Amino acid sequence: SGFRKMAFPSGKVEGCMVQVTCGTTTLNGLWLDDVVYCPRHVICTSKDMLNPNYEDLLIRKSNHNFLVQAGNVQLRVIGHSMQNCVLKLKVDTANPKTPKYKFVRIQPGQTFSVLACYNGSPSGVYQCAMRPNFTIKGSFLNGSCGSVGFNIDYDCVSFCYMHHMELPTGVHAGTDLEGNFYGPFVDRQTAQAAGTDTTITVNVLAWLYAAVINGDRWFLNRFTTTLNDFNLVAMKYNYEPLTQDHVDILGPLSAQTGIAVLDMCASLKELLQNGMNGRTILGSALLEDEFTPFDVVRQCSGVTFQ
Amino acid sequence: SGFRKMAFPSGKVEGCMVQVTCGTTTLNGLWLDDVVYCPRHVICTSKDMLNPNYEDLLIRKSNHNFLVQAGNVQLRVIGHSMQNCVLKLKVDTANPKTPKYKFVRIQPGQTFSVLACYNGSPSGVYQCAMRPNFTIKGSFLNGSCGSVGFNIDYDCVSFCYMHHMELPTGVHAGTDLEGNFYGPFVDRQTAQAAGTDTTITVNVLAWLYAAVINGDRWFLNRFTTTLNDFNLVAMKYNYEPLTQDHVDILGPLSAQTGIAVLDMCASLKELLQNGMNGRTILGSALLEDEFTPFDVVRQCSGVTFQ
């Protein structure tokens, strides 16, 4: 038993991390088959970033202007291209360590693992969630740009995130691997409003199920509630409204614990309205919303990937 | 910026995980050079576990009684032997993916990464702390036994933990890679008393420093305190006593932030006596003790390993 915030094993992703250098700037790139993916702002200087015209900036660059190093192997750049906010550097040799992979645009409220990298070398891996406002609360220092987030689905690495910038408010923003930002953000050094963030209600309920599986009763109540009436309380505490799609997602957790979803909603309702009274759930003094229902079933059944 | 509970990249360790099966039991093994290391209790049945005579049990076993699976290739076991509580299965072929590695016995309060595994397949990775009572609060289901914990020190994998058992109270226990348990525990299915656990005071201070580095300084108070007077307060709240060794270890964080170690203890003293009053520190409503001072410096300077 036990419950932890678990990241996917990163081996398959480590093999794809390269160092990409253009002019003075060095960040991380993703080498799959014979293409390296990296944030296009690698072609910028500190002052360019205030208002870059990326097309003009890239025109002054040629293939040989790009220094791509994969460990100690020098890669040869035979093409360069801009797709939305990502740069696709065509290189002469395919990555032999290329895993089975696809590019995926995830939904707000889904989770993924991040392999934080500096100069193309992996330093850590951690789990996180794409917030409802399309930000992520991560750990990215100078030169972490181009680090990617991913899920593993059996043998297939699903790349969903590439890191581009820290907002003035300290949260993080980035693109899918086709270069479309999550949210309203742009790769330019200006103040940028993230939305009002909300708590991912379906995730919080999945975590309450994880609590019961592991021995925590105490929040279980004698009440129940209705879908319509729970969302009234949700709106007051800035929880995402619950839909029937969400209730269906919680079916298996419902069936294993024997606790109907609206009964768990009633327990959560009392928690929002009266707090936790300085007691904890699965060791936490707050309500946790960074486990999807799939994350909970994986950790409580032991799904492996090889 | 940002701060996360970050695990080491797991690639080098994934390459060493195999599946080891004996009778009905299947758990995980660590294939380094031509030896597979796994818990010796794989040679036990459910009923054997009540009181195993491991010497007699291992005498009755033959090489062919050990089915070692590495991906799709089954390895041929040409020897078996017991070193304390770990079983050493000599195999026909040396692991071509063997990293530079050492076997290390860690101290209570240090941290390490766990590659949680089932049937020899990596399923997840997370950071954890060896508690002062020599247990770990991990996430281990049936067949996770033999999962290992480790640190990376530049290029060398330092294996420090092998998982063996869940205590009846739900916490976890295991050995170093020489088969010596951490703590008073034994590999037999009986009630086993773990110690009184305490909070790792030096880790909490490291995290408070991590908080200041990242912009959370509401808890900074204007006072100081003495080492003797702080430990008096610490003992009342089941914190580990702080030593000068601990103060010296926090030196670099002290110098980077401009907050003397004893001033930070004064902040912590107040935090223990009046709680957090519904504020958070680095997103958390409780005081975190699973980051060592080295963990904080790694994540705040961006040290990589590849």
Numbering used by the authors:
A (entry chain B), B (entry chain A): 1 to 306
From the article:
SARS-CoV-2 Mpro is a cysteine protease that forms a dimer composed of two protomers. Each protomer comprises the chymotrypsin and 3C-like peptidase domains I and II (residues 10–99 and 100–182, respectively), with the active site consisting of a Cys145-His41 catalytic dyad located in the cleft between the two antiparallel-β-barrel domains. Mpro cleaves the polyproteins at 11 positions with a consensus cleavage sequence Leu Gln | (Ser, Ala, Gly) to release nsp’s, which are required to assemble the viral replication-transcription complex. In addition to the indispensable role in viral replication, SARS-CoV-2 Mpro also plays an essential role in escaping antiviral defense by cleaving host cell proteins.
Crystal structures of 11 Mpro mutants provided structural insight into their altered functionality. We employed crystallographic structural analysis together with a high fidelity FRET activity assay by our group to assess the functional and structural changes in Mpro mutants. The crystal structures of several variants revealed the changes in side chains orientations of residues in the active site comprising substrate binding pockets, especially S2 and S4, which might lead to altered amino acids preferences. Accordingly, changes in KM values for most of variants were observed, indicating alterations in a mode of substrate binding. We observe the highest level of conformational plasticity around the S2′ and S3′ binding pockets with N142 and S46 being the most flexible residues within the structures we solved. Also, we observed that the charge distribution in the active site changes quite dramatically even upon a single substitution especially around the S3′ and S2 binding pockets. This might explain why with most mutants we see the changes in binding affinities and not the kcat values.
